[PDB]
Design a protein around this ligand. Sequence first.
Ligand SMILES: Nc1ncnc2c1ncn2[C@@H]1O[C@H](COP(=O)(O)OP(=O)(O)OP(=O)(O)O)[C@@H](O)[C@H]1O
Ligand SMILES: Nc1ncnc2c1ncn2[C@@H]1O[C@H](COP(=O)(O)OP(=O)(O)OP(=O)(O)O)[C@@H](O)[C@H]1O
Ligand SMILES: Nc1ncnc2c1ncn2[C@@H]1O[C@H](COP(=O)(O)OP(=O)(O)OP(=O)(O)O)[C@@H](O)[C@H]1O
Ligand SMILES: Nc1nc2c(ncn2[C@@H]2O[C@H](COP(=O)(O)OP(=O)(O)O)[C@@H](O)[C@H]2O)c(=O)[nH]1
Ligand SMILES: Nc1nc2c(ncn2[C@@H]2O[C@H](COP(=O)(O)OP(=O)(O)O)[C@@H](O)[C@H]2O)c(=O)[nH]1
Ligand SMILES: Nc1nc2c(ncn2[C@@H]2O[C@H](COP(=O)(O)OP(=O)(O)O)[C@@H](O)[C@H]2O)c(=O)[nH]1
Ligand SMILES: *[C@@H]1O[C@H](CO)[C@@H](O)[C@H](O)[C@H]1NC(C)=O
Ligand SMILES: *[C@@H]1O[C@H](CO)[C@@H](O)[C@H](O)[C@H]1NC(C)=O
Ligand SMILES: *[C@@H]1O[C@H](CO)[C@@H](O)[C@H](O)[C@H]1NC(C)=O
Ligand SMILES: *[C@@H]1O[C@H](CO)[C@@H](O)[C@H](O)[C@H]1NC(C)=O
Ligand SMILES: *[C@@H]1O[C@H](CO)[C@@H](O)[C@H](O)[C@H]1NC(C)=O
Ligand SMILES: *[C@@H]1O[C@H](CO)[C@@H](O)[C@H](O)[C@H]1NC(C)=O
Ligand SMILES: *[C@@H]1O[C@H](CO)[C@@H](O)[C@H](O)[C@H]1NC(C)=O
Ligand SMILES: *[C@@H]1O[C@H](CO)[C@@H](O)[C@H](O)[C@H]1NC(C)=O
Ligand SMILES: *[C@@H]1O[C@H](CO)[C@@H](O)[C@H](O)[C@H]1NC(C)=O
Ligand SMILES: *[C@@H]1O[C@H](CO)[C@@H](O)[C@H](O)[C@H]1NC(C)=O
Ligand SMILES: *[C@@H]1O[C@H](CO)[C@@H](O)[C@H](O)[C@H]1NC(C)=O
Ligand SMILES: *[C@@H]1O[C@H](CO)[C@@H](O)[C@H](O)[C@H]1NC(C)=O
Ligand SMILES: [Zn+2]
Ligand SMILES: [Zn+2]
Ligand SMILES: [Zn+2]
Ligand SMILES: [Zn+2]
Ligand SMILES: [Zn+2]
Ligand SMILES: [Zn+2]
Lengths: 542, 542, 542
Amino acid sequence: CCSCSDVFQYETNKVTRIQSMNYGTIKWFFHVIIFSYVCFALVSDKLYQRKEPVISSVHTKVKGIAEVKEVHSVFDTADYTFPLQGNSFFVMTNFLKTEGQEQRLCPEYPTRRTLCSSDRGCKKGWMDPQSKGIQTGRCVVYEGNQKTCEVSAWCPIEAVEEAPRPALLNSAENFTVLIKNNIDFPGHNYTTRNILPGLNITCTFHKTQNPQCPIFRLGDIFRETGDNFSDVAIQGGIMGIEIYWDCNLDRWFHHCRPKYSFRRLDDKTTNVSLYPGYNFRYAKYYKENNVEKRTLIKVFGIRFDILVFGTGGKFDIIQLVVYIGSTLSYFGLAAVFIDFLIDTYSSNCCRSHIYPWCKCCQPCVVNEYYYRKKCESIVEPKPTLKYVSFVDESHIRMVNQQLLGRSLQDVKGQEVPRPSPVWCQCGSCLPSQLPESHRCLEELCCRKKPGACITTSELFRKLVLSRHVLQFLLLYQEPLLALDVDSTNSRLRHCAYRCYATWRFGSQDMADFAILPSCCRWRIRKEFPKSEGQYSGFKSPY
Amino acid sequence: CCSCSDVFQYETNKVTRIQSMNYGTIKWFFHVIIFSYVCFALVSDKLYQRKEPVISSVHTKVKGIAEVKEVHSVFDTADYTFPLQGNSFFVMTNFLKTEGQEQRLCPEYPTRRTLCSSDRGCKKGWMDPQSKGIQTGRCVVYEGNQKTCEVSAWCPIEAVEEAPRPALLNSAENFTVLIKNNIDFPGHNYTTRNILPGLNITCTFHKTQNPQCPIFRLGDIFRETGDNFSDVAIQGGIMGIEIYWDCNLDRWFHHCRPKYSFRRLDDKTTNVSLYPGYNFRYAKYYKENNVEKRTLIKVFGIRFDILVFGTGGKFDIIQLVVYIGSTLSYFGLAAVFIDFLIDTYSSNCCRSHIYPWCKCCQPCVVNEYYYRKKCESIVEPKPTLKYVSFVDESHIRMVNQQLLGRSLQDVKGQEVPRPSPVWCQCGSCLPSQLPESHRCLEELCCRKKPGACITTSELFRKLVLSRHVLQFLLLYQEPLLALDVDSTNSRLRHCAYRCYATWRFGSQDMADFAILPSCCRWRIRKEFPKSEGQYSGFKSPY
Amino acid sequence: CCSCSDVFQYETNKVTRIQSMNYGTIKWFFHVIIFSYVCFALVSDKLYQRKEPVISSVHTKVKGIAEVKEVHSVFDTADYTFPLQGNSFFVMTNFLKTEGQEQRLCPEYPTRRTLCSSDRGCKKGWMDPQSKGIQTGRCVVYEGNQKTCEVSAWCPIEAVEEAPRPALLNSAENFTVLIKNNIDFPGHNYTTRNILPGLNITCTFHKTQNPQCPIFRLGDIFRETGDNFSDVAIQGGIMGIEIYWDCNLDRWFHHCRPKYSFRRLDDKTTNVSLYPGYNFRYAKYYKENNVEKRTLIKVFGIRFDILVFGTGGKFDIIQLVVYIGSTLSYFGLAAVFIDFLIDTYSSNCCRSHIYPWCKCCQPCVVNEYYYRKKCESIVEPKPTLKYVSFVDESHIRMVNQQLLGRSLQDVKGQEVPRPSPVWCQCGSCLPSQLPESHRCLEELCCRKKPGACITTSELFRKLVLSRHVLQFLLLYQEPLLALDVDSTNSRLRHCAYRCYATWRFGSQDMADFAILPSCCRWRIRKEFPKSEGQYSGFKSPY
Ligand SMILES: Nc1ncnc2c1ncn2[C@@H]1O[C@H](COP(=O)(O)OP(=O)(O)OP(=O)(O)O)[C@@H](O)[C@H]1O
Ligand SMILES: Nc1ncnc2c1ncn2[C@@H]1O[C@H](COP(=O)(O)OP(=O)(O)OP(=O)(O)O)[C@@H](O)[C@H]1O
Ligand SMILES: Nc1ncnc2c1ncn2[C@@H]1O[C@H](COP(=O)(O)OP(=O)(O)OP(=O)(O)O)[C@@H](O)[C@H]1O
Ligand SMILES: Nc1nc2c(ncn2[C@@H]2O[C@H](COP(=O)(O)OP(=O)(O)O)[C@@H](O)[C@H]2O)c(=O)[nH]1
Ligand SMILES: Nc1nc2c(ncn2[C@@H]2O[C@H](COP(=O)(O)OP(=O)(O)O)[C@@H](O)[C@H]2O)c(=O)[nH]1
Ligand SMILES: Nc1nc2c(ncn2[C@@H]2O[C@H](COP(=O)(O)OP(=O)(O)O)[C@@H](O)[C@H]2O)c(=O)[nH]1
Ligand SMILES: *[C@@H]1O[C@H](CO)[C@@H](O)[C@H](O)[C@H]1NC(C)=O
Ligand SMILES: *[C@@H]1O[C@H](CO)[C@@H](O)[C@H](O)[C@H]1NC(C)=O
Ligand SMILES: *[C@@H]1O[C@H](CO)[C@@H](O)[C@H](O)[C@H]1NC(C)=O
Ligand SMILES: *[C@@H]1O[C@H](CO)[C@@H](O)[C@H](O)[C@H]1NC(C)=O
Ligand SMILES: *[C@@H]1O[C@H](CO)[C@@H](O)[C@H](O)[C@H]1NC(C)=O
Ligand SMILES: *[C@@H]1O[C@H](CO)[C@@H](O)[C@H](O)[C@H]1NC(C)=O
Ligand SMILES: *[C@@H]1O[C@H](CO)[C@@H](O)[C@H](O)[C@H]1NC(C)=O
Ligand SMILES: *[C@@H]1O[C@H](CO)[C@@H](O)[C@H](O)[C@H]1NC(C)=O
Ligand SMILES: *[C@@H]1O[C@H](CO)[C@@H](O)[C@H](O)[C@H]1NC(C)=O
Ligand SMILES: *[C@@H]1O[C@H](CO)[C@@H](O)[C@H](O)[C@H]1NC(C)=O
Ligand SMILES: *[C@@H]1O[C@H](CO)[C@@H](O)[C@H](O)[C@H]1NC(C)=O
Ligand SMILES: *[C@@H]1O[C@H](CO)[C@@H](O)[C@H](O)[C@H]1NC(C)=O
Ligand SMILES: [Zn+2]
Ligand SMILES: [Zn+2]
Ligand SMILES: [Zn+2]
Ligand SMILES: [Zn+2]
Ligand SMILES: [Zn+2]
Ligand SMILES: [Zn+2]
């Protein structure tokens, strides 16, 4: 069935170009706003570029010294900064040291959960998360008359003490951090650093004056987020330095520079905050007197997490070509909307109810014309599909229901606008010669109500029964037909059926399923007799 | 060529509305399942919301003490936890310390790769990854009769010793970790913490009883993943605490709370595992006797990586509007499928082979009707395009092939259903007056097989040759044509060609490329003579 | 208005199948390249699989020892590696130690910013980021005649000293790192490790010979990126070990193995580099003589960041089904292009200018035929819409403009190809009986230029005025119409208007808005008189 002809064939939809100005306004508005929006998305979001995330690597150095008044001591970088290499770094701003701790037995600190009245109160080997040593069955005196359960631990047990305010290293707001950041785009093959040639180191980052100096003062970091460093220093906190690398690697429009933002990554430290701060414990272990002692320090400080994010984009053909396709179909949505306004405003319900009431959508009656000139109604050509027309009526009843042993005259069907026997009402219908219930189909009168027949009209005589016009139509199809055979009379009879069907039913597909009235059918059979045998019924082409 | 009329014009496709119930079933099923699926994707995946990832910041504190039996010592937080600030934290559960190491020369430990028979076996300066000191040319006795190559290193060299089982700090399953987690959505501007007001600290996380208490017991973490802490503690491992923040920031339906999950990020520790555990080495450096010594500790423990992931979504108009478009086109796929079932079930191969065999798809013959009423066949109007019809046949041969100096009577063409000279077979065809090979086109007889001609039929006389009907048709187009000029006879002749072409070829576009038989053409020319000059050939409109 | 019939109805577009070979070539080329491309995207990018990122966990151990010549000492793993657990690890390759530092007062190192001429130069309590101690008002002699401001700090203050070249631990290129990496796909439930059973540990990673051995020599890592380890070791650097896990978890085609790549994450160390290296400071605190001293070490080394990335994919039905839809519409773009080539090449401007000049796109004239057989022009049926035809002309003027009190004869309209009073030019037009300005519409002559009328032609007499043909047409619609009533004469008159409108205007929708000439209208009214009252005007159906 296939051929080079079937291969080389193009399908294009039949369209009807409506000249409606209103529809033109709507269509152009939709297309313009979709184009204006999608063109923006392309320019603003750089959807024409292939984009790659940064591969960052941060190195931080804190400079500054603090005079701690605990005797006065001096704290350098090696004293307050802890070995956090990478994105985050820590700056201790407060501490509580319990020095000289040695592994031995000692009375517990008088916490409310450690007081005893006798040795019966304290258990042996008992441990709980708030306990700083394994309890012993004895309850020793701590000091004076205070009796606390004795434990084996690093002694003296560190006191339950509030964080010392003001912060011992509240000078930490004067410390500066240099942040060296290298980004790499491997797919785009572009490496760069936030430190540029000719960079003064005496600078300090300022949001406007010096936005590209990577030496940030900690106090300025805190005052750029509306935080109080003095309050945060006492108990600690978490702060965050965002570095945003928005880079386009096009040589025409090239810019790949960092943008520094600051954001507290912790709950605000208020007077009634719930479990605030950032503290941990670490110990310095030293051997003296041939015994190992430790200095236990509870460190409260600010942890600065450095969050380097960004993207580097370079122009790519493939990305633009896909985005194009996506934006190209959006324009089509305009048609769907208007096609709906055509289908909805074509319904008879619009004219029945809404038009007489609103009276504002009255000139929207042309949608019936548009729908008539756009959509065509076609019914499944099932065998049960039939059509019946009566003279007294102006509409054709589609008989879609298979006859339940009832005369087709009585059978009711769906109305369609046009493009003697008991059932007979004209007086000229003859009884059906068809057997079984097949006769039901042929039991059809020319009109529903009693009155004059249709075959009595001279139009039926000189149009359907006229041998001249039928013979002329036969010659038209076959210019050399043999007219002396009884098959000529049979073809004459077939044409009379098809002309009554087309004369009465305007459409050809509607006349394909025509069933003629008994009066007209038998008048035709008399005018064009077959004596070979029984006449055949209506037979559906499908 | 452009006009405000061209600007304001709408294109809508012509459609034919099929009333097929089967096609309606298929279309509605497709639309319903696409709508039901896409509505789900919207509700389930929250595709109507703009979603942002969390910006987390974890702070962990481990509480608990262990009685290590190595002499009995006590290990606090500062003793087993190592300075890992951030997501991960480490809890030492085993160790091997080689204390008192001093920088000097010593015999190597008797590893199989360090035994010597004499000083010739050991090289000077030799180093390999399993060597713990630079070898010296001498081979000193370690102990008794064991001779091992002498090295310069921290001495005594740490023994190659198995991890001490049971774990020295197997009490570490009783330790609790508080995890403080703050998430931030900057675009949505929403900050929150996993610790809520009114949080008892005596709680411990339970999967059902207390799911929101952020104090996790390590043994419970391990038993919630079916791990044996006692086996993992001996050699170490890696564990992972996932915190899932699924948040929707809509005030109507607001919930942003963590969900804690546990997952071992390490290979299961079996009896025959390959290189299991998690250990490292670190040294404590102390100066005594004015010389620097170090305690080298091989630490085996569990590293808990805290993996905070999630998304916070808030309702956005733009996201819903794009998703709508995507889901809106899926419905259209229903038409493609049915349109195919129409195009496929219309082919003659369906009736030729499949219908007589299967006999089940017999009522699917209406697809031929649907295809006839939907698709129209149109052929390229190239100059070579021609049409030839013979009386004895019922189909028209499209002559698409340019004539290779052969009479058009002999030329064969593709069949199309209808909507004396050697080549002559009727006896009335006259020789072509056309010159060169142009005559070939005009060398065409009314019929393929010998027999009666077509011009002898009275229909050709009173339809094509009839001056009355031709003159009437001319008056129809021009109601005031001058009938006394020879141009009237020329227009009469042109109409006779066009009527024979339309009488014989039903379609107008098929009659545009008609080539009349020589007999009919010359009969027309005789009935409507031109004596001014030679008659013109068939000339294609394109 | 709704019915089970409206529910079960299918919309299919009317298409015209063009047999153009050129259009077939273009359509098949577009479809083939779209299919060939989208099939590739599916195979290459594995778009048919659901893909999940890895959940990695890296553990690193460095082996190797260095002979440092500072007296000769030996550095083990515990000496050069710093407590960096996780992805990154650090290997010290150089240092500068200032040992024996004690908290006291000392002269500042003679930096250019610390020299004084007297105690007036140095301030008390002054601090700046390059200062290593709080200044005191006194200016003490450092050595000889060098006078430097005295400070309180850890003394002696560390000298401003260049990094010692060659690197003290330049043997660090001989160190090996074992990297243990476990990936987990939770959604796909697949866990694996880069260390396989039967793995020799004597191996060292080689790009080709031994690509899966996870023991990397640092010198080889540097020589695989074209770096000089000896130069990098002196001042430090940042290096990166990428581990790529491209896994497909389909049992048929299963492969999940790592791929090791190396990339320097730092600026190249040249002779004139800007702020190169990677160094920090840390202190060892020891108590001797009952006083606390510290050894301050400036460590220069290489930080190796381990970047584990990858994806594991498994076949998913839903992902393939969505991708299908996206690729399925791309094919449709072929039609849009050709439909445009049809619409563009149909314009008259193509034939007017481009065709006579280029002469190469001459056979592209068939696009006019395609457009004629594809697109149909329809005009809004507004009440103001009118049509006027004159005998002397061959085109119909659409009068879309509402008449401004001017005779319709004078009014000009847009030309459309066909499918006595002052305004009168025929001499037979009668004055309008219509009142107000409504007469303007009826003031229309049969022709624009003076000459013979149209009603004098016998065709108008025997077609429009002929009572026989009009009566026959009336009988056709109603085979039993009463012909003896004056309503028969009124229907005769209505049919004469509609036939003149259809005889003159070919289209039915164009004849719906016809306005007849005054001569023909009044001739019809005389031939079919109404004496009941005034005759009505042209009234628009909409
Ligand atoms: N926190 C800081 N505040 C101000 N300047 C700084 C800071 N950290 C480093 N610098 C300066 O930046 C320059 C380059 O820094 P870098 O640390 O790489 O070199 P450096 O010689 O090792 O620095 P230094 O020895 O002073 O710690 C140096 O001149 C250093 O003085
Ligand atoms: N691992 C843990 N197990 C149980 N409770 C804990 C743990 N870590 C902290 N807590 C309790 O949680 C509360 C808040 O913790 P947070 O550390 O911020 O305050 P804190 O006073 O510094 O804690 P602490 O001094 O007891 O270490 C404290 O009351 C503390 O006792
Ligand atoms: N950097 C390295 N170079 C070479 N081999 C190594 C390195 N690190 C570990 N190995 C070897 O890999 C094997 C498994 O490593 P793993 O550390 O898990 O076991 P281990 O017994 O604790 O190793 P070790 O005690 O030798 O440090 C061991 O046999 C070890 O010798
Ligand atoms: N449209 C239509 N066709 C009919 C009707 N009755 C019969 N036919 C057609 O006419 C044919 C039978 O005609 P018939 O009277 O038997 O004459 P014969 O076929 O020459 O013997 C069948 O093929 C039918 O398709 C009718 O009521 N309406
Ligand atoms: N359809 C069709 N048209 C023809 C044929 N032969 C000639 N014509 C048309 O008739 C015209 C030539 O007619 P001709 O005999 O020369 O009469 P003349 O044009 O008045 O001199 C040309 O324009 C052709 O388009 C034919 O076989 N078929
Ligand atoms: N197409 C067209 N229709 C017309 C014209 N003039 C009148 N009509 C129609 O003819 C009808 C009026 O005819 P009229 O002379 O009053 O006869 P009557 O309706 O029987 O009284 C109206 O319904 C109009 O639609 C015209 O110029 N062109
Ligand atoms: C920070 O420095 C300024 C000037 O150097 C000084 O006035 C201020 O007191 C310092 N802050 C603290 C907390 O010491
Ligand atoms: C990246 O760019 C450098 C400089 O042009 C070039 O030497 C190198 O080969 C490039 N790498 C790739 C992967 O193309
Ligand atoms: C850096 O800036 C400071 C600002 O006071 C200036 O004094 C100094 O000279 C600058 N250094 C250089 C190298 O420009
Ligand atoms: C900052 O904190 C300090 C000490 O807590 C307090 O004295 C001061 O008033 C605070 N400043 C502001 C602006 O709240
Ligand atoms: C953990 O604690 C429970 C009760 O506090 C105790 O019975 C158990 O022995 C402890 N586990 C270890 C390993 O010490
Ligand atoms: C975030 O919310 C707070 C509280 O309403 C408001 O003060 C702040 O300005 C907001 N930030 C932004 C970026 O809108
Ligand atoms: C916390 O829970 C424990 C459970 O035993 C209870 O004893 C204790 O009183 C609770 N504390 C508070 C503050 O509710
Ligand atoms: C857990 O490990 C210990 C020591 O390795 C062993 O005695 C015990 O049976 C193990 N428990 C289970 C459930 O395997
Ligand atoms: C690295 O080892 C090789 C052979 O073991 C040796 O020749 C070379 O000198 C070593 N490199 C350094 C910097 O010591
Ligand atoms: C993952 O696979 C293992 C082995 O088949 C199975 O025991 C376990 O239940 C699976 N987990 C899930 C979430 O299906
Ligand atoms: C590992 O490879 C080395 C290569 O020299 C070889 O000598 C050694 O025997 C191998 N070990 C094993 C267990 O195969
Ligand atoms: C590597 O560095 C060393 C010392 O800086 C130098 O002697 C040697 O020439 C360098 N090698 C190369 C290939 O540049
Ligand atoms: Zn009857
Ligand atoms: Zn009847
Ligand atoms: Zn012939
Ligand atoms: Zn012939
Ligand atoms: Zn006139
Ligand atoms: Zn006139």
